[model samples]
Target: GTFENITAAPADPILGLADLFRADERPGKINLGIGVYFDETGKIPVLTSVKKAEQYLLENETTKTYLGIDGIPEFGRCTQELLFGKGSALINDKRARTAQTPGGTGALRVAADFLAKNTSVKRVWVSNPSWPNHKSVFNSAGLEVREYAYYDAENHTLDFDALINSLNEAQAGDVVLFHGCCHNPTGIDPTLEQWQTLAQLSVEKGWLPLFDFAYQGFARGLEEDAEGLRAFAAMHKELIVASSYSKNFGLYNERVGACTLVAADSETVDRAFSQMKAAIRANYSNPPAHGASVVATILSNDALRAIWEQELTDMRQRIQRMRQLFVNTLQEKGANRDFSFIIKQNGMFSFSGLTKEQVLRLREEFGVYAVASGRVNVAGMTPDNMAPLCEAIVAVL
Candidate 1:
């Protein structure tokens, strides 16, 4: 009876769509439901830097012993350097410390549990159209989930006024989550000035800022992508950062990510980290070793670091090219809506303002696939499929 009482859980809309996409044996089917990055050849790439790191690690590294609760010390340090920038005052002052987790999702879950258990924080506010996991992850930790306006569905841009209004309702002791860069579902992010304004509001309102930085280099240059995050850290004495290497490094299955806590001072970071470690210890005991080692080795060696950076830039520029092609190709196909907005969007996804029925029509008539919300993974586009893809959408429109 105990087991019978529980209902069958619904499959995750994003990942579950993969299963559905895989089963449809129809030729020329375009798969854009999941967030995985595909190159111009429509294949997921394993960067040369990652391969070299693995080769070097395979020869030089020996230990299979379990990592510490906070995982590899070097990985944590490298993660901080990437997030806060090199020569950061946060690092020099010892105000930031990170715990390596399984992936960005792991980092997020660790952060959620840590805030729920270790702090007086009771609720976490997220963007209304956030990655579905944000709500589930926070709720799984028993933290209250609240939503603030994010995308202006009608305007195809950030709903800044609605965002500020909703955030104003959130009080102190609550956590407010922001997309670090390359915001998911919708590719729009707050302008630098907009971020500065929010940073000011955060200081005055006293809400804890938490950034979900899943696609650091996937959006733009690493430093450029992290500007908003740095802006918040510049003013807020305390905040949390959950960053991942999956997108930039093409280390999707490797599960590499970090949960970084920046506090008022070194002592505060140390104290908070101890609590974070406890949460990690109880959750997964520790993180996987290979992925963190890959990240650490790449960031540590100058030559390898440069190679990784170049690879990241290539991936970023490819997404940019795809965005332009998507816009141009759509117009050439004579679609009705002004899809020029897709070019202005940053990152792998473009929130193609298609209605629910339009999305359903695309799926049924064409083999093209995407979420009901009309979120398209631009990386899924290639020169070969662009024509058919545009024609399908044009038909739907």
Candidate 2:
């Protein structure tokens, strides 16, 4: 028992469920657990644009030397353009800086450390049923993590009133987290006006806004999905955004993402950017090269950029189709309730409202795996699997 001080930690609920699904010998099992994107073939899909970029990168690439601690300069530029869009006032004013990191998780972790290391801030707020990593990352950085009301399980909707009431408690120096679009787990997002309201709330309350812009093109069109973040930027002078390319570019393993900082002016942005660089230097030291280079290649060329946009549109359109099919199939199967609300959600995942007991029953009897919170990955569904999946859900009901 020498040096056996470390004990077992709790299993990651979603990933642990995926592990269980993997071990199960059931031939008919369907995995709706993890948040990853699976094509109609049940394969971890890759983007055509990514393939083309890598092909070009292989031929013309020059160095394997380390990227700057702030990562490729083009990475920051391209990322900011996508986030704030082309011809953005923020870019023109030179009030923003982006530091490429490992991925969404890295940007978030770095943001957490920057909050802990750079600011006098001690608390951060996230939606009640958030990405889960939000809490873990903040807590690891020694910042107190709190939750604001968001999803309403009782009615299966976004509780905006309750949400605003809770967030109103946040004061100056407290950082509030937002899902830029396609709110995870629940698949619900605020209306454009609601986004404007939240933007004004942050300005009036003086709390900093931190957006986890992971699924940029997973919901609506690429630029279309950025409405909320854009609205917030219009009102807030200071902001921190995590723009992740993993889901959008289908470069998950490549680990490409950025932490973009914005301030009132170039001088203020420079000051904040210096602190972020210091924070990243102490953490991972520098970001990787391949993924970012691939993205830069695709974005820098008009033809490749168009291909990527079309590919992204293809993915988004499929998810929407599947969501509709899911609802229709459940109704056709004579399932016990109205699932029309699912079609209203926009993302890879949605709350099925299956109680924990029912979730376990679905797993045990039907061999269909889903999170106990009733969150199901809609991206995992295919036309071939849809019939069986619906039948299983109906049987469990």
Candidate 3:
């Protein structure tokens, strides 16, 4: 406990810039570091459905009592239906159970802890360039995190061959984490055939499939984006999914999410749920109610659910449009590079393939903020600012 023996902790590679950006009063300064969505006005929009639900909650005036260990039951039911189709075989047979988590991040952490405790499995294989927190979260929980190829820097596309090669060698009982859709940091995702192959391998090798899904509807339409997970569930007998409402519902501050266990049998799902509930009991105690309840209200009501879906579709379409516009602007400005990959990429991010030095120049010379790795948030590119943003990229090039 001696003060002299203490060590310094480094800043978060992704969110560390918020402090520096906040201090700079420069009006032109743009922050593309974080993945949250903003409207054309550069502000996060609270969906009308969310607003209505919150108002309803306030009027009901429930007591602020603890939720014990397991989180809101409505959240589990609604989220399961959202991920897997209504009346899915897994849910109908009691082979699936969901628990409230702080967010997608919390769900992954809880899943990692459960794996560490129940089995001798200590290694987890994540994509080469997954979200930054993935490495730290698993490692800190006494698991060894490894990387498999995901993006091809040269082709600026998914490196399916290398990914399959790595997974083929994975031993049974290993945990392989996959992104459901709109992969963070880099938006590249697997095709349907690729997913089928991976599903086959998981069955042959007996490895655990854990989906770290943060953007179900943010990339494409909700059902379209969830194709990979749905495909796996159909092909494989068991799967685990970590869900988040941050991107789709814009409930980031509320920290609402769930970890779903789709097991081979009802007994297996029950055991997994029991272990997860016990972990929640000791750690955070009970998940927060406000966010989960707010989400459930929207999903349970037909009109409200329809409104929420439209809002998510709008956000997804706008981001995709920006991707096209950004690339077009680059070509129109007569840049040497094709920049076509930006348009081909899905979800909120485009791997511009800029070098670290170029990324630094973009930030230092221009006010455009991006991760040091050349990933830009497509939602940050708006109609009004697209020109300057494209010009900035040209300047760096």
Query: How well does candidate 2 score on lDDT at residue 338?
Result: 84
Best by TM-score: 1
lDDT of 1 at 43: 94
Which 10 successive residues of model 3 have the least lDDT summed? 17-26
How accurate locally, in lDDT, is each candidate?
Answer: 0.90, 0.90, 0.85
Model 2: how far is 176 from its true place, Å?
A: 0.5
Where in model 3 is the C-alpha error above 4 Å? none
List candidate 2 stretches off by more than 4 Å. Answer: none
Q: What is the C-alpha RMSD of each candidate to the true structure, in Å?
A: 1.0, 1.3, 1.3
What TM-score does candidate 2 reach? Answer: 0.97
lDDT of 1: 0.90
TM-score of each: 0.98, 0.97, 0.97
Any residue pairs clashing in model 2, and if so which? none
Indicate the residue-level lDDT of 207 in model 3.
Answer: 84
